[PDB]
């Protein structure tokens, strides 16, 4: 499918950036997680980034570590995540869905079979956090064979060789990392680096989404003004879940408010 290509074309026509929330699938349980995701979409999310719970998420800080733990406490497995994904797609036919994966979960029972499952349920992209471009060949090959976009990362200090590889190997969108470190709302990334944004465009890379530490509308506006196609926010969204565990209605109201504000900022 062409879900990211179609989204970015539509956003361009409207002179708009993307707002893409991240949540952990099954946090704090399967049913509540499905309601959370429907709320994100209803409130204006342009695409989704969805985590499959993993035992040792080494690119995530405490907030998302804790999301993974809550999902595990609810007994969430990758198989249940794929069941959820099928239900999400069945409701929402056009929204791009990207998975945040750790390598072992993809490699586990065969890389090809993983990507084949993704295609079956209608996932659009997979980002494998601990697989750099240098180790990516079997992952990106399997992704493309199953019509899945493999997502690669452009770090702040990316050299020219890396820029060219990311532009060539990736599809769907390019991940523009705000900063070093791990996920976390408290650690605010720098302004989007115009030089990287411009080089990725020169090399015809998939459109850039800025992520890590994006927790406020101002940062979303700044990303789009710098020329990024949009922004991803995870920890800020997950904190709303964590805060409101005993108050599910309040959880959804606060998620709706936040997502709506972040999306409004993408029009800047």
């Amino acid at each position: 499918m062409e879900r990211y290509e179609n989204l970015f074309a539509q956003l361009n026509d409207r002179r708009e950036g993307a707002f893409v929330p991240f949540v952990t699938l099954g946090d704090p349980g399967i049913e509540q997680s499905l309601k959370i995701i429907d709320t994100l979409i209803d409130a204006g999310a342009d695409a989704l980034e969805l985590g499959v719970p993993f035992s040792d998420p080494l690119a995530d800080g405490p907030t998302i570590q804790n999301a993974n733990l809550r999902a595990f406490a609810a007994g969430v497995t990758p198989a249940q995540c794929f069941e959820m994904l099928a239900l999400i797609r069945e409701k929402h036919p056009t929204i791009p869905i990207g998975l945040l994966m750790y390598a072992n979960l993809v490699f586990n029972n065969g890389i090809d079979a993983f990507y084949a499952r993704c295609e079956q349920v209608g996932v659009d992209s997979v980002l494998v956090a601990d697989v750099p471009v240098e180790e990516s060949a079997p992952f990106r090959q399997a992704a493309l064979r199953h019509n899945i976009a493999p997502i690669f990362i452009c770090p702040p200090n990316a050299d020219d060789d890396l820029l060219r590889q990311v532009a060539s190997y990736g599809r769907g969108y390019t991940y523009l990392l705000s900063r070093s470190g791990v996920t976390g709302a408290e650690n605010r990334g720098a302004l989007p680096l115009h030089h990287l944004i411009e080089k990725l465009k020169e090399y015809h890379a998939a459109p850039a989404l800025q992520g890590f530490g994006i927790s406020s509308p101002e940062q979303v506006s700044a990303a789009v003004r710098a020329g990024a196609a949009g922004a991803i926010s995870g920890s800020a969204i997950v904190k709303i879940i964590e805060k409101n565990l005993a108050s599910p209605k309040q959880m959804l109201a606060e998620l709706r408010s936040f997502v709506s504000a972040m999306k409004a900022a993408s029009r800047a």
Partner: protein, 395 residues
């Protein structure tokens, strides 16, 4: 692109977030440069000799092999400054850190011996050291926590997951992914992403080089086998490296069997796990059906890790090295035996290697065999743990 091969057959690689690739490439280039630098080699040699106390003794057991055809020597890494083999490669990596213009060190530790090594090297060479240690290990290896702090290192308890070595590893790598501009990650075992398994081997290989020279001097031949415990794999690869091309010399690695392989409470992925990707490497690991990383277990904190370095996975695959396991109770018996019959208190990690050598002797007592056990550390850190056990046991 790398200067050196990141793989050992199928195993190894550089499975880290893209952000960290420049740091690994920088470390590899600095290592290749240093390895050909006579000034660096002279500085490292001087520290090993005059600060750490190399070469370490090779002790012939006088008592524990009586009435058998086994001759057993112990390579005395327990006599190295700091109390374990860990000190050797820390001195090399600390010099690399300085070479790269870094002023801070991150390390993980389980037994606290790598943490003690990191702290002592940082004090000596003027680096600011922070050490992650699982909270369970903070308790069961407590003497090492006191030692690290007295040397001015910051010791950070890790309560997540199993609160043991893998959890400390996770936190160390998370930290480094944000602090690499100023901090060197002084990984303490022959595992993790390239170039660490290579650097750690090359900065531990004096163990086997000295062993070879010492056994030739005393016996006029090579050993029939060299035996070492295997956590991440550093002391074993340090002992093995110089013997790999001596095809007659057996290389035996001992993983922790914990409460027994059948209980699932062990740390023996090389023989009982399956290949996975974690902690920057493709290697055997203990994992669930779905590919979640399992928590390991061993009485010994230094072996309590659910993976293993990729060179050991490789040497096993081609049959050049054999890997076995030893349970907590076997390790404890070997600990007691060495204390009472040789007057050496071994680390519980090292006691796994000794236990296997004692089994080789006892199972086949008329088999003529010349063995070397790598006695990777002293057991001061373990005496409270062992005491508490033997007492609860009713001894």
């Amino acid at each position: 692109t790398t200067l050196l091969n990141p793989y050992f057959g199928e195993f190894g690689g550089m499975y880290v977030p893209q952000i960290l690739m420049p740091a690994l490439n920088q470390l590899e280039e600095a290592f290749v440069s240093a390895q050909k630098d006579p000034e660096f080699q002279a500085q490292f040699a001087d520290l090993l000799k005059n600060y750490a106390g190399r070469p370490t003794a090779l002790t012939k057991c006088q008592n524990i092999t009586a009435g058998t055809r086994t001759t057993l020597y112990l390579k005395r890494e327990d006599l190295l400054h700091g109390g374990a083999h860990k000190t050797n490669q820390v001195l090399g990596q600390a010099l690399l850190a300085k070479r790269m213009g870094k002023s801070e060190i991150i390390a993980e530790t389980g037994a606290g011996q790598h943490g003690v090594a990191s702290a002592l090297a940082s004090a000596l060479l003027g680096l600011k050291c922070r050490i992650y240690m699982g909270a369970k290990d903070v308790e069961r290896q407590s003497p090492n926590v006191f030692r690290m702090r007295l040397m001015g290192a910051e010791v950070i308890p890790v309560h997540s997951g199993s609160a043991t070595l893998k959890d400390a590893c996770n936190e160390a790598l998370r930290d480094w992914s944000g602090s690499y501009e100023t901090a060197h990650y002084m990984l303490g075992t022959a595992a993790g992403p390239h170039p660490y398994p290579t650097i750690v081997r090359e900065f531990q290989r004096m163990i086997g080089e000295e062993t070879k020279a010492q056994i030739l001097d005393k016996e006029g031949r090579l050993p029939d086998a060299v035996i070492a415990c295997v956590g991440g794999g550093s002391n074993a690869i340090g002992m093995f490296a110089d013997f790999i091309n001596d095809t007659s010399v057996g290389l035996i690695g001992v993983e922790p069997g914990g409460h027994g392989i059948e209980t699932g409470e062990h740390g023996a992925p090389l023989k009982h796990g399956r290949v996975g990707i974690y902690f920057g490497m493709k290697a055997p690991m203990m994992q669930t059906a779905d590919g979640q990383i399992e928590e390991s277990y061993s009485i010994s904190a230094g072996l309590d890790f659910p993976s293993v370095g990729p060179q050991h996975a490789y040497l096993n695959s081609i049959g050049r090295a054999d890997y076995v396991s030893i349970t907590d109770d076997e390790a404890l018996e070997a600990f007691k035996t060495l204390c009472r019959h040789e007057g050496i208190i071994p680390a519980l990690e090292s006691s796994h290697a000794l236990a296997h050598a004692l089994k080789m002797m006892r199972e086949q007592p008329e088999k003529e065999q010349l063995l070397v056990v790598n006695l990777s550390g002293r057991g001061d850190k373990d005496i409270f743990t062992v005491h508490d056990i033997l007492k609860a046991r009713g001894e």
